[PDB]
Amino acid sequence: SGHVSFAGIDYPLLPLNHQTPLVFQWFERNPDRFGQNEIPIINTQKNPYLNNIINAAIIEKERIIGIFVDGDFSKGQRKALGKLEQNYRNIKVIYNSDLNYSMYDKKLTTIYLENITKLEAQSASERDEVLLNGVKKSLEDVLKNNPEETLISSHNKDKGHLWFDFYRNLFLLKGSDAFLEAGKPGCHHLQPGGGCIYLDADMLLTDKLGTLYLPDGIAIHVSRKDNHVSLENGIIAVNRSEHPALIKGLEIMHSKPYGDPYNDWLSKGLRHYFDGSHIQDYDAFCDFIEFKHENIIMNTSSL
Ligand SMILES: O=c1ccn([C@@H]2O[C@H](COP(=O)(O)OP(=O)(O)O)[C@@H](O)[C@H]2O)c(=O)[nH]1
Ligand SMILES: NC(=[NH2+])NCCC[C@H](N)C(=O)O
Numbered sequence: 001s002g003h004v005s006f007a008g009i010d011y012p013l014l015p016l017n018h019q020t021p022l023v024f025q026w027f028e029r030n031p032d033r034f035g036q037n038e039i040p041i042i043n044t045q046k047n048p049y050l051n052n053i054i055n056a057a058i059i060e061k062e063r064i065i066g067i068f069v070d071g072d073f074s075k076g077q078r079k080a081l082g083k084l085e086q087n088y089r090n091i092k093v094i095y096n097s098d099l100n101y102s103m104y105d106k107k108l109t110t111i112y113l114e115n116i117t118k119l120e121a122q123s124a125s126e127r128d129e130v131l132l133n134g135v136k137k138s139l140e141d142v143l144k145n146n147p148e149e150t151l152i153s154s155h156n157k158d159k160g161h162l163w164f165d166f167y168r169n170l171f172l173l174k175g176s177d178a179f180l181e182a183g184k185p186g187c188h189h190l191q192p193g194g195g196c197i198y199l200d201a202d203m204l205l206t207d208k209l210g211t212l213y214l215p216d217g218i219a220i221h222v223s224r225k226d227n228h229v230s231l232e233n234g235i236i237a238v239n240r241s242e243h244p245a246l247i248k249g250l251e252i253m254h255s256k257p258y259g260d261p262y263n264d265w266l267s268k269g270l271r272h273y274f275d276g277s278h279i280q281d282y283d284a285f286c287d288f289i290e291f292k293h294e295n296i297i298m299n300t301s302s303l
Contacts, residue, residue: 004215006288007279014217014239016195018210021064021176023198024053027096027164028071029157039080040073042201047301049201056205057091063209064187066179066196068171070096070164071157089186098182101170105152106254112139115257135257151253155261165233165261168198169249175241193241200234200299207295218243219291220270221298229286231267234299237291245273 003012026041026049034040043050057065069081073095081093112135119132142149155166171178176194179187195217197209203221212219217239221232238246249269253259271285280288 004288006215006285007275007277011215013213013215016197016212016214016217016237016239018060018063019189019191020194020212020239021066021092021179021190021196022056022060022205022209023066023068023171023196024056024201025068025164025168025171025198026201027069027157027167029160029163031071031073031077034077036074037076037080039084040071040077041067041069047202052201052204052300053091054088056199057088059205059208061090063090064179064190065091067091067093068096068168068198069093070167092179092184092187094178094182094184096167099171099174099178100181101152101167104170104173104250105150107148107150108138108142108154109147109149111151111254112136112142112257114255131257138257151259162261166265168233168236169246169261169265172196172198172236172238173242173246173250175238177241195237195239195241195243197237198235199296200301202299202301203235204297204300205295206297209293209295212237212293214239214291215274215288216243216245218245218270218289220266220289222286222290223299229283231270231286231289232299233262233266235291235296245270248273 001013003010005011028040028042031040039050041050041053053065053067067081085091085093115135116132116139119127119135155162157163174181175196176190177192179190197212214237219235219237221235223230223232246265246269249265252264252268252272256264259265270289274289275285
């Protein structure tokens with residue numbers, strides 16, 4: 001079609017054409033279980049992820065493919081990627097540290113003390129003292145820990161899947177203009193403030209994707225098992241840099257102690273923007289926001 005309507009509000013279908021890079025990501029918790037001249041990206045029987053990205057890139061030789069990487073990498077491991085970039089020159093390896101996220105950041109001192117004030121400003125006969133006393137100990141712990149400790153820093157390699165699911169959302173905020181910001185070659189063909197398409201390393205390209213259309217230019221993976229639907233970070237595709245729905249999620253991260261990429265940023269951000277006030281069912285959002293493509297065998301890590 002040409003559009004779709006949700007909550008009584010109308011939403012046009014926006015193009016994501018074959019310029020639009022596929023993004024993969026690998027945040028490797030440990031680099032030293034790899035050879036120091038091995039591409040520090042996992043390619044094993046249960047998940048041969050390094051095979052699923054190349055084959056993706058081969059199926060799409062004339063669309064850019066980004067590999068969003070992060071980990072304390074040996075010089076030789078960085079040149080394993082280097083060989084990978086010249087041996088296939090649509091592939092663009094991008095180091096997390098080569099991007100500046102300061103414009104999207106916040107200090108937990110700030111974030112906590114905000115909530116401390118909000119709660120203390122409410123009726124004592126109404127307020128969440130249980131929470132009121134947790135954010136102050138979180139406060140108590142960050143002071144002693146480190147004055148200038150922020151959201152972005154917190155969600156570190158130590159913090160497991162919050163490491164890579166947090167920075168993912170940041171990446172997409174920066175979108176296609178991030179190929180430029182690290183300095184990656186032969187990316188002049190990317191449009192400004194342009195979108196991207198993240199992929200779990202395990203969503204398998206089979207055949208060409210083509211030119212995607214979305215409600216307001218955003219879609220995400222939705223799980224459907226067996227009797228269940230969820231929204232997933234397995235696929236994320238936007239049509240531009242700093243899409244609002246994710247922007248709102250970045251705000252909810254700034255305005256909540258203990259925000260979470262999955263529940264707060266991704267999930268509630270999308271849905272508050274799309275459904276600020278909850279007129280449509282959750283599922284009827286999941287359907288409205290679902291990313292459909294027949295040429296990808298979705299989320300093959302469950303097998
Ligand atoms: O050590 C890891 C493990 C996972 N991932 C990311 O998590 C995504 C999906 O992970 P997987 O399918 O293995 O786990 P699931 O979330 O499906 O259980 C991958 O594409 C990666 O982007 C990562 O960056 N580093
Ligand atoms: N974003 C994702 N696709 N996450 C994984 C969801 C499926 C999960 N691997 C399972 O056990 O079924």
